[PDB]
Amino acid sequence: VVGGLGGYMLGSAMSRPLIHFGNDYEDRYYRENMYRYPDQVYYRPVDQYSNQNNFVRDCVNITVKQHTVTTTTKGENFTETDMKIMERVVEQMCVTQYQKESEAYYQRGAS
Numbered sequence: 001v002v003g004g005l006g007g008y009m010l011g012s013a014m015s016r017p018l019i020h021f022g023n024d025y026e027d028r029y030y031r032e033n034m035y036r037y038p039d040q041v042y043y044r045p046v047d048q049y050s051n052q053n054n055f056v057r058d059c060v061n062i063t064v065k066q067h068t069v070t071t072t073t074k075g076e077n078f079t080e081t082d083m084k085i086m087e088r089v090v091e092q093m094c095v096t097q098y099q100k101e102s103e104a105y106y107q108r109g110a111s
Contacts, residue, residue, distance in 0.1 A: 004073050005066040008042035008059075011097035015039065019088045030085055041093045042066060050106050051098065059094035060087060 016035045021027050041063045046055055064086070071077065078086070103109070 004070045005042075007066070008044055008062050011041045011043045011093070012100050013040045014093065014096060014100075017089050017092040017096065019085075019092055021085070021088070026085070030089070034089075037089070039093070041090060041097055043094065043097065051095075055098070056091055056094045060090050063090045063094065 016037065016039060018031065018034070041059060043059050044062075049055060064083075068078075098107075
């Protein structure tokens with residue numbers, strides 16, 4: 001079943017990302033089985049700015065929102081603690097999706 005998201009595009013797939021929170025519980029909490037989460041995010045042609053603030057932060061909020069509405073339709077809730085990780089991991093995906101091929105076109109950063 002899928003019937004609630006529909007606004008933004010569909011960004012390229014990848015591996016499960018993993019950010020260094022360095023708190024070992026907090027790391028484990030995802031390192032356990034995190035592959036169950038999506039490994040794509042939802043973006044828009046931003047142009048001009050490319051990679052300023054809202055490029056990632058808006059893309060996080062949209063991705064989050066296409067799940068908050070989902071969960072509101074489903075009958076579930078998240079934690080602030082999950083959301084801390086979720087934000088970092090979706091934030092990373094919204095950068096890394098752009099760094100796949102958008103960064104070959106737009107932007108730079110060989111080192």
